[PDB]
């Protein structure tokens, strides 16, 4: 499944875009 | 859990922000 993460997608996840949540920018990782 | 949806969060979900994925804007819904 895909998740919003800060600072970055972790090992085994790939970045597909970004999220805005709680006034901050997150990586959208699947 | 939270998900990115187009056009909008559905009944029983609340919008907490947005996602950018595949060149489009999505609602971030929890």
UniProtKB/Swiss-Prot annotation, chains A, B:
* Highest taxon of source: Eukaryota
Q: Which residues form a coiled coil?
A: none
Which residue positions does ADP-ribosylarginine occur at?
A: 14, 24
Give all Phosphotyrosine modified positions.
21
Disulfide feature: 2-30, 4-19, 9-29
What protein name is recorded for this chain? Neutrophil defensin 1
Q: What lineage, starting at the top, does this entry show?
A: Eukaryota, Metazoa, Chordata, Craniata, Vertebrata
């Amino acid at each position: 499944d895909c998740y919003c993460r800060i600072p970055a997608c972790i090992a085994g996840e790939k970045k597909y875009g970004t999220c805005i949540y709680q006034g901050k920018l997150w990586a959208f990782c699947c």
